[PDB]
Every structure is written in structure tokens, then in C-alpha cells.
Structure 1
Amino acid sequence: RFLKVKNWETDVVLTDTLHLKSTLETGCTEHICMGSIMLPVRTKDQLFPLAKEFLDQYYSSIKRFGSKAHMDRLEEVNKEIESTSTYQLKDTELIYGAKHAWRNASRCVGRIQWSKLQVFDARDCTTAHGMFNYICNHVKYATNKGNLRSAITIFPQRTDGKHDFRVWNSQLIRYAGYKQPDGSTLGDPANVQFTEICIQQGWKAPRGRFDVLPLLLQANGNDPELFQIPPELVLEVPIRHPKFDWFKDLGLKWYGLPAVSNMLLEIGGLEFSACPFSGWYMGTEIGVRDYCDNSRYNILEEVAKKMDLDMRKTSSLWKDQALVEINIAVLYSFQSDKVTIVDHHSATESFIKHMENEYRCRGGCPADWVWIVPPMSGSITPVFHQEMLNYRLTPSFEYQPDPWNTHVWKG
């Protein structure tokens, strides 16, 4: 049974057979769509069918389905599960798994790059200091003096859920936020809650506007420990504007490496609860969301003031106008410092080409239109007119509750 999607700007129609391989649920039903809902402990019982399914996929991809290496591996995993109640992925399987978790990430516009992922095996790690050293190396390799390279570091998988590895930071590099007694916020409001945990764990907060947060790392279920990334490893870009000389005086900067560290990697029923992964920014992530969201740095007002816009009535579109300039400045600053960045016209065009190629050679490409469409200038990007099917494929990256809500404290 086939399903069709139509690009209404080019009348290109593609056919999706891949959605039949979907297993997990979406949250939607025949009578309700939850497409805009942000967010819609495992035993031997349900694990071998998950392993068998992953291994079938793995050996199909290497054109060895039904081979002796395939049947032998199935057997070996089988006995290892009934005997040890889990199993270990080979290096080849881990790398395939991590690449396909990205390939399957329906909300990721950057997936044209999925096959060029540098996979760092940190499964021998045992301590938070060992985590800090693995993460320092990831940051150095991925940053590459501005010539950014996609990377993932994979720490030991969950066993009984009482010995999890977790990175408590939502991203490896993020700026601190401090709520002031007068109700205002110093720094990134998005990080106030995490900043307070850090201070409570003994972090000495400089209390500046762009302080890089410490790493808060949890190994084998132990209490998390604080470490400071060497500042020389944190590449930062001062934001200036190519026409507006006063823009630099706003004193803004941003870090070069987007490295998301709070998601869970699922491969063949195995759960990798600490698996930081990094790429490079789309400009709007910083310029639209990080600076102009009302609940973020919210520099929209000051930029509009310095531009001398009609800020009286919103129908003057001063907000829209300031937003475009801030994003021009983000792109200009990164390009001038030769730090890898992509604008949202380039990134959406590439994704369409990626999506079409995936329909040709894979039978589909799961895609979350709500998330793929950029947060500004939506309809003048080619994804806006593109119909998309959203379904859940594994290997996958999943959400997980923040660890401070679930952690049993040692003391």
C-alpha cells in the first residue's frame, strides 16, 4: 500500500512505501491530530524482537541478509540476551545505528549530511572524569578551528536504569541564565533552571551575560560531577552587523558548536542515555530563536530602538524588520570568522533534494513539517509548499525526562 505527497509549488509527487516499516506510534489517531504537540526499564521479554529487527536491517544494508554471518550474529545475540539479559553491539552496528538514528530524525532539516557522522565509541567509559575527557575530545574534533564536523560520542547503554550515564546539560556548550531579585534575567533565560542546579552543586558563577556553563556529568548512576570545558576549546563568534556599526555595541556573541546532549539513542532495543551529538548551526536557530523569542535574550526591542522603527503599532512590522537584521548579523559574523553556518534558504533547499533522493533510494523520508519549516520567512522556503509524512522509525533519538527529576541521590 502506497502513499503520495505533493510539492504544491512544483507539482512533484513522491510515493512513500517506507512508512510501512514504521513500528512506534505517532500520538495521532483517525479522529485527532497531535502534529503540533511538543512531546507526544526494559526486559529480555521484548528485547530480542527489537534486536532481530535491527540486525535484519543491518545485514540488509550490507547485502548480507540471510548470510551465515547474519544467522550467526542473530544466534550469538540470542544467547547473550537469555544469558546476560542484554547484549553488546559490534562497532559496525553501533556506527550504523547512530547514523540511522540521525537519518530517521523526522524533525531534522539537516539530514542531507547523515552519512558523514563521526562516531566516537565511549562505551568503555566508567567515571565522570572519563566522560569529561571524552567530551573534551568530541568538542575539539567537531569544532576543528571553525570548520565544523558532525560527531556523536556514545557512552555505555542503560542496564537496569539504576546505573545510567547522563549528561545533565541540554547542550554541551550553553550560556548561563540568572534570575534577578527584581524579576529580570541576566544571560540566557532558557538555562536559568540548569544554571541554578550548577550553582547548587558548587559551581562558582561569574554572573555575566555569556558565561559558558560547566559540564554536569553522571557516570554509572552516581551523583553528577562538575567540570569546566577549557575555554580554548569553546569557539565563540562576536555578533556584528555588516551595515549597522552600532550592532557590535549590543555586546552579543554566540558559540560555534551546537551539540545536543539530553536525548536518548535507541538502537536494537538498547538505550544509550548519554550520547551527545553535534553538527553546525542553521542561522535562524541563533538569530530567530536564541535572541528574539520573548522568553530568550529578547533583543528584538533594543535592535528596533537603535534602528529607529515605528515601535508604536505592530502593523509597522518593526518586529519582523528587526528579526531579519539580527539574522543577517548572525550569518555575517559566522561567515566573517569562517565558522561553519548555513542560512535557512540553503538548508531547506538541500533538505528537499535530500527528501527526494530518500524517496527514490529508500521509499520515503519521515518529516515533521511543523519542525522542518524555518521559524521566519516560512513560505519563501521550498519546504513550506512541500507535503510530508511523519512516522517513527528505529534506530531513533528520543526524548527523556531531565535527570534531576528522576535521579536517586547518593550523597
Structure 2
Amino acid sequence: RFLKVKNWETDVVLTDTLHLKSTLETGCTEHICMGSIMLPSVRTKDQLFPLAKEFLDQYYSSIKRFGSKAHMDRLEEVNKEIESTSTYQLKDTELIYGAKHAWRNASRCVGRIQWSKLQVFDARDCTTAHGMFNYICNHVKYATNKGNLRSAITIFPQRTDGKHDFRVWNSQLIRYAGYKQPDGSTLGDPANVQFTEICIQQGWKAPRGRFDVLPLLLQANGNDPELFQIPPELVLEVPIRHPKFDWFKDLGLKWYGLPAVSNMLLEIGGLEFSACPFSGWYMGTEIGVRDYCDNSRYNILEEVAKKMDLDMRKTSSLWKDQALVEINIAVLYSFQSDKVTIVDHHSATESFIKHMENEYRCRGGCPADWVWIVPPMSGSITPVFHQEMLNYRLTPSFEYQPDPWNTHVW
């Protein structure tokens, strides 16, 4: 009930008491652990007020005014607003707090040492998809900051009846298109083949290239989604070169500077924000390990190993492993050269350990998903590999939600 986590590299033991404030399910039971499952598969008036109460209780505790004059008045005011309107509206201060804590609670995020520095853009006055586009251009420009990346979230109006949802149809604000070739192969990003089709079906003029920045597909107020092209000059991209292999340029690789997730749902006080794009800066392995080397993505390992003249006949030569390191050297080198913020997996995981220790000391815990926190290369030489972690669900939270094309009454 007062659980312990151990670091097996340093023998440091921390005691977790924050998990007793956990709420929703993990997907696990005493009979089966689902820790490696990627996704374990509107609010009536009752459901809504305790969620509001739990949130306002922790907000007012955080500002040292729990059980106080303003606390009771706010609880009473929101109660009245729910009885009347069957929902309520957050004060600006509560919305900023809720968003920073949604990030703080993201158990799959290794970069949470930064959680308190989030720039929150209140877009709750937006009414149309052209407005959403304007809000998102300003987000992209603020966050990019000429390569000195700054964390940001832009929060569009909350769900109401459920038929008037705001949605960003793109999974991320900035991603490359994917096209099926006539000969059967795939050009561009194979992960984005279906979404690219909906872009064309809704009218996109695809330039069928390999690194075509997809257009935004924005849905305001439950209406039909509309296409917009992000101003090219707002999309910072990095050509990938290697500090040793001059032939690395001829691979033609590039990637964008801004990781910006736009398909998640932000829950604060029982209220649901279905369109809440947020951005930070990349950890190098996201690009070089997953984006470039997954067999289901750009899958460049075999090409890179051939230019390195490695023995690709036997897996035990570790040729895949060697090329993988070099690819990830080049990504870091490229971003660092062009002065685009990026963090390597050693720096990011060391920061998370210090963040964990801070959260245990000052908060009593830190929910953490080891399966996602440990980087996809060189796992055991990063400090998080040796760190036991407890995973549990705290609110405010970012949650997955269904892809809108499977939901939208067109």
C-alpha cells in the first residue's frame, strides 16, 4: 500500500505513495499483466461533479488555499454551473494548471522534467477551421522559435454534447506523406498511407514525393474537416548528414524539427478537450531508430549498411547494430549543426532519473511506463533500464481517442 521502487544500478530505493490517488484502470489484473499492450481497449451530470471536485481540490491544495474561502466558493460556483448547464468552464488559471499536470502525469513521457515550463495557448474562443489553422500556425511558429524549441500546447473548445467536437485529423501537426507505388512498394512514410488517401479524397493536390509535408485537416464544431497547407517557411527541416561519411548526404534524408502530437484527448476536471496539439523537441532515437529504421517505416538499414560495406550475410556480424548507431550519430549531428534543439537518449534518460527523484521527494511518486521510457536502442546503458517503475493513471491526463474518420458522420 506504500510501495517501493528500486534502482538496481545504484541501489537507491524510493517509496511511492502517490499511486493511492490513482483512478482509472491500468488494463492489468492480479492474473494478467498487460504492461506491453499499446492500447488497452458524454458525461452525465453526476459523473461530472466529483471529477470537477477532485480537480478543484488538488488545484486549491497546490496554491496553498485548500479548504479556504475562495476554494468553497469555486466549488459551489462550479456545482451551480453543472446543475444548470450540464457542464462548466475552467478559469484560465485552472486550464494552465490542468494542462501542465496532464503532461506531468503522462507515464509514457521521458521528457517530463520540463513539465512546468509549458506555454499554454487558450484557443477556446475558436469557432471555425480557418481559426484553428491560424491558432496552429501561431503555435508552430512560437514553438519552433528559429530552432530554439519551446514546449507549447494549444487548447481548442471542449466537447459538449459529443456531436460538436473539434478535431485535428492529423496524428501529428508535421508528418510526411505516404504513397503506394504501382510496383507494390511504398514511397514516403508507410505509416501515413491511409491518412494521405483521405487528404486526396478530401481534395489534396499531392506532389507524390518522398518527404511531402502533409496538409492539416481541421474539424471545427463537429463540422466537416477542411484542408490547409502550413506555410512552408514555418516548417523547420533538417537535412541529415554524417560527420564522417560524406556519402550520407546522397541518401537524401531529411526530417522536421518539431514533434507535435495532435490526436490525443486532454481530460481536465472531467472536461474533454478533443483537439489539443502539443509539442516539445525530439529525442534523437525517435528519428534515427524508429522513423528511419523500423521495417514498417522508412526502413533504411539495408541501404546504409551497403554503403558502409558491412558483412550483411550473417546477423551475428551485428551489421544492423553498427549502421543503427551511425544513423543516430548523423541525426544528432545534423540537428546540432543547424542549431535545432534535440536531446540524445543518454541526456534525456539521465534527466528523467533526476525528475523521478524530484517527484518522489516533493510529490511522493511518479507514474512511469518502463516499456515506453526505455529508449529503443542501447537500453541497458541508459540509467532508466535499471530503474524499477510503477505505472498508474493520474488525472488530468492525455488519453488516446478514436481516429475521426471512423467516427465522423460525413
Report the counterpart of residue 389 of structure 1 in structure 2: 390
Give, in whole Å, the separation in 1 of the partners of 2:146 and 2:361.
36
Kindly state the Cα deviation for residue 180 of structure 1 after the two structures are TM-superposed. Answer: 1.1
Kindly state the Cα deviation for residue 397 of structure 1 after the two structures are TM-superposed. Answer: 0.1
User: C-alpha offsets along residues 81-100 of structure 1, whole Å, 9 cap, x if unaligned?
Assistant: 01000000000000000000
User: C-alpha offsets along residues 145-166 of structure 1, whole Å, 9 cap, x if unaligned?
Assistant: 0000000000000001100000
Give, in whole Å, the separation in 1 of the partners of 2:103 and 2:205.
36
Kindly state the Cα deviation for residue 37 of structure 1 after the two structures are TM-superposed. Answer: 0.3
Kindly state the Cα deviation for residue 177 of structure 1 after the two structures are TM-superposed. Answer: 0.5
Kindly state the Cα deviation for residue 311 of structure 1 after the two structures are TM-superposed. Answer: 0.5
SS state at 2:384 partner: coil
User: C-alpha offsets along residues 126-179 of structure 1, whole Å, 9 cap, x if unaligned?
Assistant: 000000000000000000000000000000000011000000000000000001
Give, in whole Å, the separation in 2 of the partners of 1:121 and 1:200.
32
Give, in whole Å, the separation in 2 of the partners of 1:91 and 1:16.
31
User: C-alpha offsets along residues 177-214 of structure 1, whole Å, 9 cap, x if unaligned?
Assistant: 00112210100111111111001100000001000000
Identity over aligned pairs, percent:
100
Report the counterpart of residue 73 of structure 1 in structure 2: 74
Kindly state the Cα deviation for residue 55 of structure 1 after the two structures are TM-superposed. Answer: 0.1
User: C-alpha offsets along residues 50-74 of structure 1, whole Å, 9 cap, x if unaligned?
Assistant: 0000000000000000111100000
Kindly state the Cα deviation for residue 334 of structure 1 after the two structures are TM-superposed. Answer: 0.1
Give, in whole Å, the separation in 1 of the partners of 2:251 and 2:46.
58
Kindly state the Cα deviation for residue 218 of structure 1 after the two structures are TM-superposed. Answer: 0.1
Give, in whole Å, the separation in 1 of the partners of 2:392 and 2:180.
39
Kindly state the Cα deviation for residue 222 of structure 1 after the two structures are TM-superposed. Answer: 0.2
Kindly state the Cα deviation for residue 347 of structure 1 after the two structures are TM-superposed. Answer: 0.2
SS state at 2:349 partner: helix
Give, in whole Å, the separation in 2 of the partners of 1:285 and 1:250.
19
In the superposition, the TM-score normalised over structure 2's length comes to 0.99
Give, in whole Å, the separation in 2 of the partners of 1:183 and 1:72.
64
Kindly state the Cα deviation for residue 45 of structure 1 after the two structures are TM-superposed. Answer: 1.9
Kindly state the Cα deviation for residue 330 of structure 1 after the two structures are TM-superposed. Answer: 0.2
Give, in whole Å, the separation in 2 of the partners of 1:195 and 1:43.
37
Kindly state the Cα deviation for residue 43 of structure 1 after the two structures are TM-superposed. Answer: 1.4
Kindly state the Cα deviation for residue 104 of structure 1 after the two structures are TM-superposed. Answer: 0.1
SS state at 1:246 partner: helix
SS state at 2:58 partner: helix
SS state at 2:218 partner: strand
Give, in whole Å, the separation in 1 of the partners of 2:22 and 2:159.
24
Kindly state the Cα deviation for residue 109 of structure 1 after the two structures are TM-superposed. Answer: 0.2
Give, in whole Å, the separation in 1 of the partners of 2:9 and 2:380.
10
Kindly state the Cα deviation for residue 42 of structure 1 after the two structures are TM-superposed. Answer: 1.6
Report the counterpart of residue 59 of structure 1 in structure 2: 60
CA RMSD of aligned residues (A): 0.4
User: C-alpha offsets along residues 285-339 of structure 1, whole Å, 9 cap, x if unaligned?
Assistant: 0000000000000010100000001101111111111110000000000000000
User: C-alpha offsets along residues 230-251 of structure 1, whole Å, 9 cap, x if unaligned?
Assistant: 0000000000000000001100
Q: Does residue 33 of structure 1 match 2:33?
A: yes
SS state at 1:383 partner: helix
SS state at 2:383 partner: coil
Q: Which runs of 5+ in 2 are unaligned?
A: none
